[PDB]
Structure 1
Amino acid sequence: MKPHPWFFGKIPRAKAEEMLSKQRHDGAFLIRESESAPGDFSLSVKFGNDVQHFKVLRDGAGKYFLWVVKFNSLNELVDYHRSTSVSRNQQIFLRDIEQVP
């Protein structure tokens, strides 16, 4: 087992945009710990010449979700959205960013 290449911890929202702007393929993403909402996570995803940000929402039990389907972990939320679009305006599927060697 290896650590997940998508967890960047506490990095500025702007830093996520800077990084993902350099990614070549739509869907490139990262999970970060929100600075405006301590204790909450945010998902930043590249699409075209833009970087979209999503709030990782929680239900009453602590499960995570973006829209309707929820999961017992960020890990499962992320994997589910690799084959189900994170967007309702475009078909954008999460894919690991091109990691630096």
Structure 2
Amino acid sequence: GSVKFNSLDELVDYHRSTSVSRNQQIFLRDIGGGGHPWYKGKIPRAKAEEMLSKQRHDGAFLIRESESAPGDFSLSVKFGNDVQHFKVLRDGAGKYFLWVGGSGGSVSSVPTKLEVVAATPTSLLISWDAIWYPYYVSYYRITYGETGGNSPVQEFTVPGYSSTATISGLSPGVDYTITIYAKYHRAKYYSSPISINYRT
């Protein structure tokens, strides 16, 4: 998933009017004679940033053959400050696209449900819903400790392909604050948190 194109021409045409960025409004725009508007064949990545350094306008772009992944294509794009490189994904039938999945109809990277599925007096099974590009989370950090004072909160990470976790070795009768941080690939920062309370 989700939107897929039968060819490079068709991918290019779609991303003239739909952003290539999940957060910003960045549309593909031709480099400023009689040659192909945007394909540059087997040309290197340093070179692609040479052809795009001289563009002031957002969305300047070419598509080159990929260096690190022969037979694949790369899409190079100017984003105000920097030159960004996209990998052109192919699916099972060899359709082309840029992003697996989609937002949730959501505008934030914070997990949206966080719930206790089942519980004993010394353990928790919890679940959550990441709807914003779940395929792009590298891992979740789960923290838990007594609500209020005092000691170190306990932490562990579960892989991004996971939607549930198990918390163990808890004291009966204690109120816990349970929190989850999403770490997208590759955001600089964890996403901001979502937490829950539960008393064993």
Task: Work out whether the TM-score is over 0.5.
Answer: yes
Give 1:46's aligned residue.
Answer: 78
Corresponding residue of 1:16: 48
RMSD, aligned α-carbons: 1.8
Report the CA distance between 1:60 and its aligned residue.
0.3
SS at 1:16's partner residue? helix
Partners of 2:97 and 2:35 in 1: CA distance: 22
Residue 95 of structure 2 corresponds to which residue in structure 1? 63
Larger Rg: 2
- Give a deviation string over 1:31-68, Cα, whole Å, max 9, x none: 00001111000000001121000000000000000014
- Give the structure with the higher percent helix: 1
Deviating beyond 6 angstroms after TM superposition, the runs of 4 or more aligned structure 1 residues are: none
The CA distance in 2 between the partners of 1:3 and 1:68, in whole Å, is 32
TM-score of the two chains, using structure 1 as the length reference: 0.62
SS of aligned partner of 1:43: strand
Tell me the distance in 2 between the aligned counterparts of 1:56 and 1:4.
19
- The whole-number CA distance in structure 1 between the counterparts of 2:100 and 2:68 is 23
- How many residue pairs get aligned? The number is 68
State the distance in 1 between where 2:35 and 2:51 align: 19
1:27 aligns with 2:84: no
1:49, 1:3 → 2: CA distance? 27
Pick 1 or 2: higher relative contact order, CA cutoff 8 A, min separation 6: 1
Indicate the percent of aligned positions where both proteins have the same amino acid. 93
The one-letter amino acid of 2:60's match is A
Deviation readout 1:1-40 (Å, 9 max, x if unpaired) = x864100011111111111010120100000000111100
Higher strand proportion, which one? 2
Decide which moves more: 37-46 or 15-24: 15-24
When the two structures are superposed, what TM-score results if normalisation uses the length of structure 2?
Answer: 0.32
Supply the distance in 1 between the matched residues of 2:35 and 2:57 (Cα, whole angstroms): 22
Is this contact kept in 2: 1:21–1:49, CA < 8 A?
Answer: no
Unaligned runs of 5+ in 2: 1-33, 102-200
